[PDB]
Design a protein around this nucleic acid. Structure first.
Lengths: 142, 209, 38, 176
RNA sequence: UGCUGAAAGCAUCUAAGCACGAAACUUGCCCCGAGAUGAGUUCUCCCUGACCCUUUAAGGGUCCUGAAGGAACGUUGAAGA
RNA sequence: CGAUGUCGGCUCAUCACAUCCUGGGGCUGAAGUAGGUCCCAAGGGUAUGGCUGUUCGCCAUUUAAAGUGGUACGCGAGCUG
RNA sequence: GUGAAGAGGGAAACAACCCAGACCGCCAGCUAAGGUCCCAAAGUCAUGGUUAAGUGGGAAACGAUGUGGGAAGGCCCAGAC
């Protein structure tokens, strides 16, 4: 016979809420990336989005070690020529901290159409409450 | 504070008493009448939407007419919106007149400038023309070079080339208001403002110090 | 002051201090002895 | 180490409250409150204040020493208070106090008005002296450093806002 | 450049804590901007019929209706290849 | 080598900072004015002419200053020759 | 010795470096170099240390109370620093 393949019409996938207070950024990020791929499920299939929906909250309260609070620099280029634009970690936490968790997880997820579809399942909030009470996210303690 | 929506009537001059001509632009500012008030509790920002002038009854559509009908106001020729300044308060249907500028001393006037169409880079970007003689072969007003060589082998973004000049929003800042005439509904500012005659202006108080 | 890559005590009042990961020579007697970056 | 090992002898009528790491000390001169480092364990033991390194932290001894000296200063800051004394050397340098604003005339084309913070009270017994008093030590050190910082002591003549105790070393011009 | 302050019973701008500090940096000013596929918000306007078929699905078809509005056409514009 | 046009001028740039100006600062054999030297700083700015094919240079007169380099010693399917 | 005339795995990508030499097939197992947090298969393994510099993840003479270890030595509670 043939190896089982998950079918994306029939993938059941759950909702999880994770409190990101005082977690380390990379270690949380790597756990979220694992859950959004669907690597924790026995029906994992590399071309099917099998993962779960995670609601990260308290994103502004995430922690980093060392002097990464001030020395970790987020560069991006704007397309216009001298457009190299940097922003440290504390400037990003002040401006938009959702971008901190989302940049991390996005760089841990496979690049391509599927990993974009995998990132659409991450919902990050800078506060303590979310609109998604209808989906009943159970508390993923990680 | 808020501003008012005018109409560029044209230019004249104002002879002062000591004999100094002042080039003024005449801006007829009729009764700007508030059609909507926006609060944080419904919109996330405090701002008023005003209308001005008058429109034909058969030319205003049913969406638009229902909007002005809710506001309890005559349909105007457009809708504009001004952000409010934290202690200001307006009601729907309240009329606002040029009298508001009776204290302001200096304003900023925002209009659409006159459309000059597809303009070449000598008009548009003030490039300097190459030789008009001395050998020059079919390249008098052309832009010259547009970039470097193998490194980069691309033209960079926002290279100044030729294209549509004009017909866009420009704001002239810090114009001295010469008269406020509440009788004739007029505002005389010192200088040129953007736009052809009859164009809609937006006159706010100056944000610069 | 003097940014050098050998900083030393030139006088007996000169004093080596590391501030912000930078070796410095702070003197009280002569301010010409103030140095940085050893 | 040798500083943290000596205890802070707390005199009579001085209130000490140890809310975990937060220490409130209120005596005759004013309420004054810090929050020590996590590497410092402080124990009252009914008579004095004793400072020790919290176990599990590397530099805690060093931290303990600081906590020691800080609270020592706090005890003086609720008993006797701290006083800095500044003097203004120069022709036509003026100092006056309106409320808690120190007006200063320091050879500028504009008046200098330094707003003292909440806890600090300056006096001027002369036009060329500012005797400022207060409870917190870094705060009057700060304020005296600011008033000095408007016009620092010029080296050739001595003109500036100097401290009353500090020596200002001078020198002559190049030649003649 | 400092203030307080130990490790180093002194000293010390730093290790804990605190204050200044430049045309650079983030804003403030002007313009573009929801294809921002993460495609948002607000206000208003319009549409309130029957009946068959099947491999019963957000399925197909017939009749009756055709709104708000848009587009076309024309007269055109200090808008425009 | 079954072709990658090579100096200089023009037009048009663009980046680096080992900074010419403007901005902050330490030491001075820094009285002031003007400097010297070193640290920080790339925001914006950064000549016209005589001679010469000249880049360069010398000269004249300015200027806050007339920066140093990279970009096929940037730029000939952009011009000259 | 390899390439040339040698594929495969590794060194990101990389003839010549490391592992290894492809007759064909198999949705079977064990391994080499190299690796086991996520992209990306496999230890976010166990025990004991070290560094806080993102060192790791360029670069010397030379400079320095950074910090862990080792063997000695001068003075010292007839009180040393």
């Amino acid at each position: 016979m043939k190896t089982f393949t998950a079918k994306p019409e029939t993938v059941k996938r759950d909702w999880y809420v994770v409190d990101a207070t005082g977690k380390t950024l990379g270690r949380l990020a790597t756990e979220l990336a694992r859950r959004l791929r669907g690597k924790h499920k026995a029906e994992y299939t590399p071309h099917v989005d099998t993962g779960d929906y995670i609601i990260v909250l308290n994103a502004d309260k995430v922690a980093v070690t060392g002097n990464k609070r001030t020395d970790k620099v987020y560069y991006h280029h704007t397309g216009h020529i001298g457009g190299i634009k940097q922003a440290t970690f504390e400037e990003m936490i002040a401006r938009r901290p959702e971008r901190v968790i989302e940049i991390a997880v996005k760089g841990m997820l496979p690049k391509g159409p599927l990993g974009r579809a995998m990132f659409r399942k991450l919902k990050v909030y800078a506060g303590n409450e979310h609109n998604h009470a209808a989906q009943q996210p159970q508390v993923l303690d990680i | 504070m808020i501003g008012l929506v005018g109409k560029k009537v044209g230019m004249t001059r104002i002879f002062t008493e000591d004999g100094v001509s002042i080039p003024v632009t005449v801006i007829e500012v009729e009764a700007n009448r508030v059609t909507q008030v926006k609060d944080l509790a419904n919109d996330g920002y405090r701002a008023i939407q005003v209308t001005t002038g008058a429109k034909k009854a058969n030319r205003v559509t049913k969406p638009e007419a229902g909007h002005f009908a809710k506001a309890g106001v005559e349909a105007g020729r457009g809708l504009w919106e001004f952000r409010l300044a934290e202690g200001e308060e307006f009601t729907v249907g309240q009329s606002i007149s040029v009298e508001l500028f009776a204290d302001v001393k200096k304003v900023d006037v925002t209009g659409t400038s006159k459309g000059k169409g597809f303009a070449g880079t000598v008009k548009r970007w003030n490039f300097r023309t190459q030789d008009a003689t001395h050998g020059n072969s079919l390249s008098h007003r052309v832009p010259g070079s547009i970039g470097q060589n193998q490194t980069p082998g691309k033209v960079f973004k926002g290279k100044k080339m030729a294209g549509q000049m004009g017909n866009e929003r420009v704001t002239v800042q810090s114009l001295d208001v010469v008269r406020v005439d509440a009788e004739r509904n007029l505002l005389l500012v010192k200088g040129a403002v953007p736009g052809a005659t009859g164009s809609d202006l937006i006159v706010k108080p100056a944000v610069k110090a | 002051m003097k940014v050098r890559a050998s900083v030393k005590k030139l006088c007996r009042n000169c004093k080596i201090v590391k501030r912000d990961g930078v070796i410095r020579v702070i003197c009280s007697a002569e301010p010409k002895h103030k140095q940085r970056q050893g | 180490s040798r500083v943290a090992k000596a205890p802070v002898v707390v005199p009579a009528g001085v209130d000490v409250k140890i809310n975990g790491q937060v220490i409130t000390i209120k005596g005759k001169n004013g309420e004054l409150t810090r929050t020590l480092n996590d590497a410092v364990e402080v124990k009252h033991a009914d008579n004095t204040l004793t400072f020790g390194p919290r176990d599990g932290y590397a530099d805690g001894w060093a931290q303990a020493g600081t906590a020691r000296a800080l609270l020592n200063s706090m005890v003086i800051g609720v008993t006797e208070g701290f006083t800095k004394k500044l003097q203004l050397v120069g022709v036509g340098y003026r100092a006056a106090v309106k409320g808690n604003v120190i007006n200063l005339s320091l050879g500028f084309s504009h008046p200098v008005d330094h707003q003292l913070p909440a806890g600090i009270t300056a006096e001027c017994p002369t036009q060329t002296e500012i005797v400022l008093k207060g409870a917190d030590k870094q705060v009057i050190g700060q304020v005296a450093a600011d008033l000095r910082a408007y016009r620092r002591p010029e080296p050739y003549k001595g003109k500036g806002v100097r401290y009353a105790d500090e020596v200002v070393r001078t020198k002559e011009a190049k030649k003649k």
